[PDB]
Amino acid sequence: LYFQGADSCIQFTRHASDVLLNLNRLRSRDILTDVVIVVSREQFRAHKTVLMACSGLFYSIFTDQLKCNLSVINLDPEINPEGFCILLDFMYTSRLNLREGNIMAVMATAMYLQMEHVVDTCRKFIKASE
């Protein structure tokens, strides 16, 4: 549906999440993906704009006039690829699959990627688990 928003424009409730869903479908089909992220020898295709929109690190990389033309970006080879995969999934879905078994790897990776709200959330869940 839609609603009358604060600015008095018509606002579409599901639009942002539909856009994100459609970008994730493109990613699944490898449509218009323009970068490969390499972690611990594993490769992940993505759209630079989505990466930038979610991560301070990717924002810095792709606004650099030298690095914005790289179509392959290697990350720290100590990054847990599953940690990366979970965060990439989050970027494209809004859903973060946080578990006791993975939380430390996810949090370290989010710190490295400068994903501040994810780092905060990871912090709170650890606080509670201790």
81-93 and 103-113 helices, crossing angle to 10°: 70
Structure tokens at 111: 């710190």
Residues 13-32 that bind ligand 7ZO (CB under 6 A): 22, 25-26
Q: Give the number of residues in contact with ligand 7ZO, rule: CB under 6 A.
A: 3
CB 60 within 8 A of CB 51: no
In contact, 123 and 107? CB cutoff 8 Å: yes
CB of 45 to ligand 7ZO, least distance (A): 15
The minimum distance between CB 126 and ligand 7ZO, in angstroms, equals 37
Question: Looking at beta carbons only, is 32 or 104 nearer to ligand 7ZO?
Answer: 32
Strand order in the sheet with 72-74: 42-46, 35-39, 72-74
State in angstroms the smallest separation of the CB of 27 from ligand 7ZO.
10
Which residues sit at the interface with ligand 7ZO, rule CB under 6 A? Answer: 22, 25-26
